[PDB]
Amino acid sequence: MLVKGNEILLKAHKEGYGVGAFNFVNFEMLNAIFEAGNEENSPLFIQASEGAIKYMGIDMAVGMVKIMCERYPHIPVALHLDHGTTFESCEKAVKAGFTSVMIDASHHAFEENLELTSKVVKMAHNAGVSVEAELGLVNPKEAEQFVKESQVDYLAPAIGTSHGAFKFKGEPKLDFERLQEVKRLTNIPLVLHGASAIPDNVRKSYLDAGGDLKGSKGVPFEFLQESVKGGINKVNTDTDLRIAFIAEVRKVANEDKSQFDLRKFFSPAQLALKNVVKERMKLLGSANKI
Amino acid sequence: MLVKGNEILLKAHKEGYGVGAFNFVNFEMLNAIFEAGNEENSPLFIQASEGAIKYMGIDMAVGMVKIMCERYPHIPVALHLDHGTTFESCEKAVKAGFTSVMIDASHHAFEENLELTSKVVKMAHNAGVSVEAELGLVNPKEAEQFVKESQVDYLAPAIGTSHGAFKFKGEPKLDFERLQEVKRLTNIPLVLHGASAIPDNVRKSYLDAGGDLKGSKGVPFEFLQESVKGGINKVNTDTDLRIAFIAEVRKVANEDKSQFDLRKFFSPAQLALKNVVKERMKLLGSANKI
Ligand code: NA
Ligand code: NA
Ligand SMILES: [Zn+2]
Ligand SMILES: [Zn+2]
């Protein structure tokens, strides 16, 4: 059923596994994520970006999740605001029924990031909602102070991905010892952003269907595995889902120019997305944890 | 808000206009239909086929509609089971919260069609839900007896479209005088099936995006207008929505092989579908009827 984000992530923190945090923008994505969690007996951490909330309406985003929870009442589910950019966006998500909110002030200096994060924490904790923040590479002693003073529930430290305020050109490299130091000093669940791991079969599906991935690479599965070993407990996953889904839409469009039954496009798209989610749950170690 | 189907169609019957009955299979179709009704100040008949219910789950089909009704509480909305094929399907739709159900037994002989329809009517009326049935071209005196004995709320008579149990080869032609006879004898709201228009702009968008419309032709807008003139009050509309929607999906796929943001595909697809709905509301006479 619907639970606070910290309930899912504290278990992962204690037991040393990662929970994929899977984005959705509509019914098809959400259904595939839930079926994957059901088939792998995995907790579900469901994310909606601010753009997804604008697209669906926050009432529909929460409403569809509540319907799905009732359909699979044995699965723990958290509903998380991904990259909230203002206090008011986080508060609206809290009021609408989200059970986790992320405030991204990582482009601000330490003091301003801490101040806004703490304000979000005060509001969210009063409503029983858990909070994620982001900090950058990160200095572990600054992360220690940031966590202790803010009371944030989980932190996304900049540890080597090209993402957000910490974009760089070049092969990403995981700073494992830095990760371990952040983990040891903060003793909270940690979150990895910017780690798309386009599986070989998904890449092939997308290219075969005529797609172009313009030298976009993501990271190898080993990067994700090593990150979990080092204490990452939440792995944001969106890009990989979209590529798998749209590969099947492109394929249907290519192979039958007369096809306009939406279900003929979106049933195979859901299946491909579901399979990405299932494999990611197995890779990160949340399978069979419910 | 969500209302019994006959509340919407009795008004259309009394005042001589038509209400589009628009199918959905997911959130994008539903949102576009609702925005059209809001923008044209039109009542809404929202339809889900048995296949759409299996695809969404009946809990999600009803649940999404209820969310949309709360977003637009001033719009009368009926939620209708399209081409129900069994008593049990109709009963499941009643129990889930549909406010109108169609039982299609038009492939059976009169006696058996009447028996099954009458059984559905008794169950649905006991729950305050309206019922549609289908009969075929139709003999008006048989339609008269069928309506009197079954107490069905609205009837889809076979009046010249190639559809369902009444498919023929050659050009479909409205039997206007037969329609008026059925209307005079039954004196209930009447329903038109199998009348896809495929507007020129929709056809152009689909073919420009590389589609193939496999020698499928729509009935002229004149067909639809004359049908309403003759007593049609509900016009089933699905094919035209799908073509407009998928044309935009195909176009996006064609013009950017690197695109996999679902919103980039489905926002223009929603807009195209919305505009088909708005134009149909204006054509049939339900615009400005709220
Ligand atoms: Na996040
Ligand atoms: Na129908
Ligand atoms: Zn981030
Ligand atoms: Zn029919």
Side-chain angles (χ1 to χ4, degrees):
Chain A
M1 304 183 231
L2 197 63
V3 301
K4 309 310 167 57
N6 72 326
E7 179 174 324
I8 290 173
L9 297 184
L10 285 165
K11 181 176 173 62
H13 164 69
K14 288 211 305 274
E15 303 179 4
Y17 64 91
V19 179
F22 300 104
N23 286 77
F24 76 113
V25 308
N26 69 10
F27 165 69
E28 278 83 6
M29 294 186 78
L30 188 65
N31 190 48
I33 291 162
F34 265 84
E35 291 206 289
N38 184 60
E39 296 175 13
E40 293 300 333
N41 284 293
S42 167
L44 287 170
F45 208 104
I46 307 288
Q47 304 206 133
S49 67
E50 292 182 332
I53 289 172
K54 186 170 193 182
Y55 177 83
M56 281 180 283
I58 204 168
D59 52 328
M60 185 64 72
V62 180
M64 286 194 299
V65 171
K66 289 189 182 304
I67 292 160
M68 295 298 300
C69 281
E70 290 298 327
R71 195 182 280 191
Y72 300 99
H74 62 291
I75 305 182
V77 176
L79 175 54
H80 173 84
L81 173 67
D82 181 25
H83 285 83
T85 57
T86 69
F87 172 86
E88 288 74 19
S89 175
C90 292
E91 186 178 43
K92 277 177 175 179
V94 169
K95 290 186 188 168
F98 278 64
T99 64
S100 175
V101 294
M102 188 237 181
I103 178 64
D104 181 14
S106 64
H107 54 285
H108 290 110
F110 182 93
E111 182 190 343
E112 286 61 48
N113 185 3
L114 178 60
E115 182 178 321
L116 176 54
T117 294
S118 298
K119 183 184 176 182
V120 171
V121 169
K122 194 181 188 68
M123 175 279 302
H125 285 185
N126 177 81
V129 173
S130 320
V131 183
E132 182 184 318
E134 183 160 4
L135 186 63
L137 297 181
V138 65
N139 178 266
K141 298 296 294 187
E142 294 176 18
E144 181 186 31
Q145 183 191 0
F146 185 95
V147 169
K148 166 173 144 57
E149 296 195 11
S150 72
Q151 304 202 339
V152 75
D153 301 288
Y154 20 105
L155 179 70
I159 54 169
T161 59
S162 182
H163 167 78
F166 327 113
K167 287 189 181 64
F168 61 87
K169 256 92 190 187
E171 215 179 8
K173 188 65 164 183
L174 177 65
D175 194 340
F176 184 80
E177 282 292 325
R178 187 180 303 270
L179 170 53
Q180 284 183 312
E181 187 72 15
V182 174
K183 186 69 178 184
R184 143 173 51 262
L185 294 179
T186 61
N187 195 20
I188 60 170
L190 300 180
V191 187
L192 182 61
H193 294 183
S196 161
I198 306 163
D200 289 335
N201 57 312
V202 173
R203 181 184 299 277
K204 178 182 150 56
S205 181
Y206 192 82
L207 301 179
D208 281 359
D212 183 4
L213 287 169
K214 310 199 295 184
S216 177
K217 293 256 287 169
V219 303
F221 287 155
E222 286 71 20
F223 191 114
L224 298 181
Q225 297 177 299
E226 195 171 18
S227 80
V228 172
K229 284 178 172 53
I232 292 300
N233 305 122
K234 177 172 172 278
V235 181
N236 290 28
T237 308
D238 188 352
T239 299
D240 298 333
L241 311 189
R242 305 180 187 198
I243 296 171
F245 188 99
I246 294 293
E248 304 296 334
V249 174
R250 291 178 176 279
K251 179 177 178 290
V252 172
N254 294 338
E255 293 183 341
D256 185 353
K257 302 300 189 170
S258 73
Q259 185 58 265
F260 50 80
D261 180 346
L262 277 65
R263 300 187 295 155
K264 291 283 188 303
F265 287 85
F266 304 144
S267 289
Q270 284 189 58
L271 178 56
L273 193 156
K274 185 188 70 167
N275 286 341
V276 171
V277 176
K278 292 174 63 163
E279 291 302 312
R280 190 61 38 93
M281 290 165 167
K282 292 185 285 190
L283 182 72
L284 302 179
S286 73
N288 296 306
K289 290 291 186 169
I290 67 177
Chain B
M1 17 198 86
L2 197 57
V3 298
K4 194 176 190 301
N6 81 340
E7 190 180 308
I8 291 175
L9 297 181
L10 283 168
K11 185 182 179 294
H13 167 64
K14 166 180 166 292
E15 304 177 358
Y17 63 93
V19 178
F22 302 99
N23 285 77
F24 77 112
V25 305
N26 68 10
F27 164 73
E28 279 79 10
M29 295 190 74
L30 188 62
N31 190 48
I33 292 164
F34 265 84
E35 294 205 282
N38 186 61
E39 292 167 19
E40 294 298 335
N41 286 299
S42 174
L44 286 166
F45 237 81
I46 306 295
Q47 300 208 131
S49 69
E50 292 185 329
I53 288 166
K54 186 174 296 304
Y55 177 82
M56 278 180 283
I58 203 166
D59 53 327
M60 183 64 71
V62 176
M64 291 191 306
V65 172
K66 286 181 175 175
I67 291 161
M68 296 301 301
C69 285
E70 291 288 339
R71 187 183 285 191
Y72 299 102
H74 65 287
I75 308 179
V77 179
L79 175 53
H80 170 92
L81 173 66
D82 182 26
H83 286 82
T85 57
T86 67
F87 174 84
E88 289 80 7
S89 177
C90 295
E91 185 176 44
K92 279 178 170 175
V94 165
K95 288 182 188 172
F98 281 63
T99 66
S100 178
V101 295
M102 192 236 178
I103 182 66
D104 182 14
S106 65
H107 54 289
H108 296 305
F110 184 91
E111 187 174 276
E112 284 65 50
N113 183 2
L114 176 58
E115 184 184 352
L116 176 49
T117 296
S118 295
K119 187 184 175 179
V120 168
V121 170
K122 199 142 70 67
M123 176 277 299
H125 284 187
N126 179 86
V129 172
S130 319
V131 182
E132 180 184 319
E134 182 157 6
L135 187 68
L137 300 186
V138 66
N139 179 269
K141 303 301 298 190
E142 290 186 343
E144 186 188 11
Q145 177 187 1
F146 185 95
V147 168
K148 293 290 189 179
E149 300 189 13
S150 71
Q151 288 299 302
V152 73
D153 299 283
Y154 17 107
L155 181 63
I159 54 175
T161 64
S162 175
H163 163 79
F166 324 120
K167 283 198 195 67
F168 44 90
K169 314 72 166 323
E171 199 64 17
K173 186 182 181 300
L174 176 69
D175 193 338
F176 182 81
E177 287 296 329
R178 187 182 302 263
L179 168 57
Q180 288 196 123
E181 188 71 3
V182 170
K183 186 69 178 190
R184 273 188 303 266
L185 296 179
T186 61
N187 192 34
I188 57 169
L190 299 178
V191 188
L192 181 68
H193 294 189
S196 162
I198 309 177
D200 286 343
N201 63 309
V202 176
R203 177 182 295 277
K204 179 186 198 300
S205 284
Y206 193 79
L207 302 182
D208 278 359
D212 174 3
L213 286 166
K214 280 183 170 179
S216 60
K217 224 115 70 187
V219 300
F221 288 150
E222 306 89 62
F223 192 113
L224 296 177
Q225 302 169 294
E226 198 180 6
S227 296
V228 174
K229 182 180 172 69
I232 291 301
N233 308 116
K234 176 175 172 286
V235 178
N236 290 25
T237 306
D238 190 345
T239 298
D240 296 339
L241 313 182
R242 306 177 182 200
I243 295 169
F245 187 98
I246 292 295
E248 302 302 327
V249 173
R250 289 179 179 278
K251 179 176 175 68
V252 169
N254 291 339
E255 293 177 346
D256 186 351
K257 300 301 190 179
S258 74
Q259 184 59 261
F260 50 81
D261 180 351
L262 277 62
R263 299 173 304 168
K264 294 288 188 293
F265 287 88
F266 302 148
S267 290
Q270 282 189 58
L271 176 59
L273 190 155
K274 187 186 72 169
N275 287 338
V276 169
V277 177
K278 293 174 71 172
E279 290 308 307
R280 183 61 60 85
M281 293 168 162
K282 291 168 59 186
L283 185 72
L284 298 179
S286 69
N288 296 308
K289 293 303 249 204
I290 291 172

